[model samples]
Target chain A: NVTLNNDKISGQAWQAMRDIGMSRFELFNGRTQKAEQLAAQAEKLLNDDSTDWNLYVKSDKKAPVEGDHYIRINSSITVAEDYLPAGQKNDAINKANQKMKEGDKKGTIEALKLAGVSVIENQELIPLQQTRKDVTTALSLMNEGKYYQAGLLLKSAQDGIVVDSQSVQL
Target chain B: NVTLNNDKISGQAWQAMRDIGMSRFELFNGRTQKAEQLAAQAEKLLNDDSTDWNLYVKSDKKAPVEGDHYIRINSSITVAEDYLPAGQKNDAINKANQKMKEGDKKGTIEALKLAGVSVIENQELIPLQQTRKDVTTALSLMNEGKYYQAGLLLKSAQDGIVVDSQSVQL
Candidate 1:
């Protein structure tokens, strides 16, 4: 017969209550079931004795500091590494370069969202705000049939930004 | 030692020479070697004594009107099925619907390249022309911070188009 510690059971119960609360909140808030399902899957780790659930406990008499260090190490090295900036940077640059070539200022702004760039005041504003303004003015002139002046203005706007290598193909 | 008929060998040589010429032309014109390779592999059937090559030769000694029909049954089926316009209308409608929902007028044009739908002058030009105008107007309106008007135009463009079913949950 294996005797389980009261601290372990109590700690797990507390965490479980928190988990249930958060899951229920998410469910009622119209969050996808995928997140809750993922959490349920992770709960198996706590139930299994072989898993390092003691690392999550804060109590004394059970290598709490060492457990915390191990938990921090595991989380930082594994989970945190997945969230690093380098991974998102490539996607951001690719999207920006694509939008710039297609003359899609809106798409460029939307792409900036992944990099945590906020457009609080003027969400309608493109990331290439100044360049887009000049370009728009040039386009308006061209629509008025002033071809030569419009062409010069367009060239001036284009000169402001260094075109990305991939965008040159367009 | 087996004695071979000079006349039959001459006839086979002539056919082989024609086959080599056709293969060279196909390679020069960027045709994939996959079909040529399959034909060459199938020609191995000629080596079998039971295979009746003379049956494919007419009584006048010319190639039969439907020559090699026996050996080419499989290839004929493939070629016939490949070029036939079966379900072509359904395919066009599906492609048109996809382009409409995606707001991709340019892609819609490229998709219809092989379907006798010319850009400037063709039978299917009216719908494509109208779609292009609507999409362009919607795109320009979206850029000008008129999202409600742009959305309405986009909906008008997509009214008859089928879209992929997905979850509506936040």
Candidate 2:
């Protein structure tokens, strides 16, 4: 069982939330220097995939001493790692039987990937404030016939989900 | 000026709304034959890029006789086309001036693309249905420690915004 913990958002996150709460979207004109730095740091740590740093989390800057933030907008995410559980071999055989019935041409290959997932990781991410800020800017640009500019902003917004994760073995 | 028309959704979309009224998200296991065909039709129409068909629009199959759906979910979208408008050349020059000030080495190239937009098209798309169906499936798979399958479904869901756009000259 995963020993999940609940904590409130930081005072900074709380202020951002109150400021941007359900407001019209706009261009993310905030200073991205710090955000990009954190994203680069994580990319180096993950060493698996290149990063698309769009928005950064404030929580990554410091861990809080207080535990009263029961605002359970869960930051924890699960990931499959190349680790092993107790019934690793048997689970693969069972999964292989199911995959054979499922009848994919590349079923065995996919089953191998499935079986290889011996470790499961739950990552904690304190997702920063509103992610929809660029929508209004994009739409306003579209209304002005500035489609290429609008599209570029929205495309960058598509890359908004970068993360600095701390993983716990489950 | 672009003269626009606002129309209501079809009976099919209305029925889908009634059935799926903001319930939990799920895997889209419905018939994709017609939707994919429409997506392909649009794909052939827009040959510059390949297609990623997630959800298909029913309205693309047939134009309606009676238009009454005042749902401004905004099927009409604007796109940059290589046609001609008044003062196309001057706009490029003005944009180049600003882009130069913006200080990007590749700014001129982007300004050329900006200037190349001689025509803007207003496209009409009757978006099919709810886009969040796979969210629950992805999340449930995560809870089960099935990350690959969950991610694959979510990735396919990422391809959900296929369109068959008809362009109108402004």
Candidate 3:
């Protein structure tokens, strides 16, 4: 219910990211979806060419990089979906509500993360090389007005970045 | 001040550690003591040869490793000495005390790191490759009972482990 500015992967690693052409954009949603019927959405994003893709282009105002095109940039580390056990969630929710009563905004979110009510996101890093490559291919497709094909090519690049996650012992 | 059972580099990385021959021992003190003292502790640990060293040998009973010895084992993290702004420490300490009143052990600690009151740790990861190299060199030094020289060599070995840290932007 409450919104939070997530702690990003900062310090040395985040600084190193800018050198390699990447930086964090504002927080975005990474909610898990479920469709008990259709074959997974990942495959569906590609097979159906009629679907128009949403192209997201964001600049790191703090430190702009040459290659920073993520549909939505997120942290490199993420809390696992079942970070805390099911039984633990409700107990934490009560604690979080108590903090909210006491005016501890940061602590409230941290507790809600324990409760699993707050949205903790998935991690992703976009590789510069592959992203530029796909964009180039899509540029040609767009000239011929093959909009769907262009979107498909760019989508390929967007989804193709190597996923690197740091799973620290909590 | 209270002792804490640290959350180690566990989950995926800790398992990967065992594959590479490293594991966590019990929490050891990482107190930052000052002396207006000897150059600095890190370098002095090497220069002084009179210091007959104490070698710690602990088996990780959960999963014994072929190589696990450190005069002391510590976490791969330290909340910076001046982590919070100078004036913020007292405010956090008051908050931690309030949590203590409510009988919330974990919340009290979460508050205390904010207060910089608890023994929050400095992290170190002991690498197997360089350690084996150092130990081999020290063994030859010890053959003639060059205990001081040997201790220096082994201390260098123990201290030489690559320092890897995950700094999540908080």
Candidate 4:
């Protein structure tokens, strides 16, 4: 017999509630049969993804904070840090800066190309279409003989990237 | 007549570039005539709305920062803060809490209904279709006498809301 308290609810149950867009309070207050049914659904989802337990646990704990009270579940696209690691970007930027210091515009352009690839690989993470287009334009500029201009465009984009924890609905 | 240095470009211009999916760097490096054409376009957009200048100025200044280099332009939908202010939400939440304290389920439900309206009003700001649908579901739950569930769903959404200066591509 499970006690009906916030603490008693499992993380998978929370995620299931979130995923199905069902309110936990509603399930709790509704017919006992409905709550039990949803609980079983949550358990199934939990069992299905045995390998992805860490993210589920983290998301479960973070889902109920005061700040995330109005978040739309399964709707927002979070930036995949694994897809575009910040460290790789920093390394590319550092390499570009060193090449710039050495007066090697070609080398600088090469480094920026690597950085641009990182951005492109995580295109879905970008929140807007226009910014992605701008990045594409910057890459084209690199292809042209306009190295300085390409660097400036990349810099402009680099400055405006937005990566936040909160998710927005489209 | 104006020189097109980074400083001379207005916020409206940056926004226009983002909106039109143009790269400022590409325009800068392209024909001087093209840059001038874009400048004219930016001016037209700026003149179309005189009342909204502060956001433009702020956007202009911040557009050139390093963090936003790969941002998607004109593809993001931000929540309409004016339509649903935080203060209004707090008041609604407070009213609901008071009603809960008084053991008035009906009054609590009423307060939550108002709160739910605020969430509904800003539905367009959400970026994903699925999330919006989830919000709609929560609203339906609210109408179905599931007050606690509705409030919890709303709170879950509230915590995951994203507010940022940059835009992303679709």
Candidate 5:
């Protein structure tokens, strides 16, 4: 019995598979409920594989043509939910903080985004959404001498926004 | 007289012309030797203005051939120097830094490269080469606890790299 190597298929043949119907792991992983539904809608295009795919060749055929082709359609979209490990997130967060310390607010925000904790909900979408609301709000409240209110709000916001240790979808 | 608006090309187009063929004004404006050389390189490619750019169309009559006649040799290559204005550069640089801060080292490098800067000499084929080097050197020295050295390098690099208030190209 011969052992078949599937890893090779992933190198070059995977490109063809991807072109046909494979979902990009990272993009797939980032999919919200809406996004997953949209992806499923797109997948419906290739549902009738037996009817839609035809195999044809010319009388003096050299290679298979459009008619005589087989299409492999993936049923499930594989989301790269575990794209980034926990360590990477920590590193990115550290880098973002360093940028902020270096007087590079833009850099700091970007680093936080990379850490995958920028979103208001996710914490990593910060760069795109610009969610340094904590710092800005804190400064304003402190300036107005509402120290107690500012502290309470800051704690509530931080506490309300949960940072998931698992499911590092970058 | 039907006036054809030949002056439609500006900025990049103008710069392209100046790059390939010496513009009298550019020569008078004290362009660096490197800039003049780049301009000359672009000019050589454009000298063959009269060369027939062949375009093929379907014949009036169809033959045994499967498809219509098509021109294959109509490929065109264009090179632009300082194509981006300063505003674009600032945005791009900010974007790059943001990417870096977000934990996208590769993206950050790419942004910096596009913005025309890098730590090492990319043959000075890229813009902001010197500035990138300066920044890189400062970053390294700072990392190594040579704060004074880092400051000097940063100042020198910053001095050489001028950010145009309006133009994206530095």
Candidate 6:
């Protein structure tokens, strides 16, 4: 029998988990009381001292360095999609992913650049707003045909919110 | 008589100035065509090369450090008030001012803290959004009665936008 305790989880830890689209019930494969076990795991990850939360860019890959705290969104996670403002489409993001799939480097770059602009246009939904100058600089880099650097900047602006929200204790 | 040359200013510089609430026309006391002189002044300030833009906190004293690039708003200028959102009163700001006048350190801190929250809530109008963690840390510091440190953090967040905007140069 797999038993779990949910009573010891802190509200702040639970909120942090929810912010990243994780739920207590989902932690134990829909089993009750396993929320506590997941919460304890999250708490351990949050307080992990070995890994620093730093952004790193390598080629087309962009994410916080792996040793740091990270969260994965499940297939059923609608938190981010539902958080989009009314009438906003995820077409740019979809296009970017499709371009990546076709191994179309330039196409991927252009699509990602557009996706970056969309992020800026809907910055309120994202907790942190990139400086207008930084966004402009990325655009300028794109115009100069420095696609990789531009994509990195745009990717950082788009994904940084996730790391920041996860940092919140409450 | 002062003549201004606006042609030398880059569009990026002009946009940056506008983001921080400076208008070419307002630079010359709203006189026609002297907008060029103010633009020239701004251009010179942007390229001064002698000073670093940094935030400093002093009770009731609000101005950039001397020798740094600074733009002063004339007393007759209505730019800031006109820029505020409709139906919003500057009461929290005014209350902060009044508390400072009364030498009520704690009251002033509380008032300014509210002012900081107001800035965060209306961040769309303000170009820069400090990380949520930074804002949360300031709030925690305030909760612990560490008013000065909290004030410094809030003040730094508020002034950082000015420095960043000023850095934009096409």
- The best candidate in terms of TM-score: 2
Each candidate's clash count: 0, 9, 4, 52, 32, 2
Which 10 consecutive residues of model 3 chain B have the lowest summed lDDT? Answer: B23-32
Residue-level lDDT tens digits of model 6 in A80-124 = 111122234377778888987997655754665455321111111
Evaluate every candidate with DockQ and list the scores.
0.01, 0.05, 0.02, 0.05, 0.01, 0.02
Model 3 stretches with alpha carbons more than 4 Å out: A1-170, B1-3, B6-72, B75-77, B80-92, B98-105, B112-121, B125-133, B142-159, B162-170
Chain A TM-scores of each predicted structure, in the order given, are: 0.22, 0.33, 0.34, 0.23, 0.22, 0.25
If ranked by TM-score, best first, what sequence of candidates would result?
2, 4, 3, 6, 5, 1
Off by over 4 Å in 4: A1-40, A43-170, B1-40, B43-170
**How far off is residue B50 in model 5, in Å?**
7.1
* Model 5: CA > 4 A from native: A1-27, A30-34, A40-170, B1-31, B53-170
Top candidate by lDDT: 3
The TM-scores of all predictions, comma-separated, are 0.13, 0.28, 0.24, 0.25, 0.15, 0.22
TM-score of 1: 0.13
Q: Which of the predicted structures, 1 or 2, would earn the higher lDDT when compared with the native?
A: 2
Chain B TM-score, all predictions listed: 0.21, 0.33, 0.34, 0.23, 0.22, 0.24
lDDT of every model, 2 decimals: 0.31, 0.34, 0.36, 0.35, 0.32, 0.32
Model 4 DockQ reads 0.05
lDDT of 5: 0.32
lDDT of 1 by residue, B1-170 (tens): 00011112122322332333232222212231421442253233234356454433213322122332111100000000124274784465345434433434455444444333423210000122233344456445534534323334444433312222222211
- Give the alpha carbon lDDT tens digit for every residue of A70-134 in model 5: 12211111111111355886777789778878976457545765763321111100010011233
Candidate 6 iRMSD in angstroms = 20.0
Q: Put down candidate 3 lDDT per residue, A46-157, tens digits, no spaces.
A: 2235632222222231101223333323442222122234468778879988988998766765676577432222344443333444444444444454544444444444
Cα error of candidate 5 at position B142, Å: 38
Better of 2 and 3 by lDDT: 3
Q: Which residue runs does candidate 1 get wrong by more than 4 Å?
A: A1-170, B1-126, B160-170
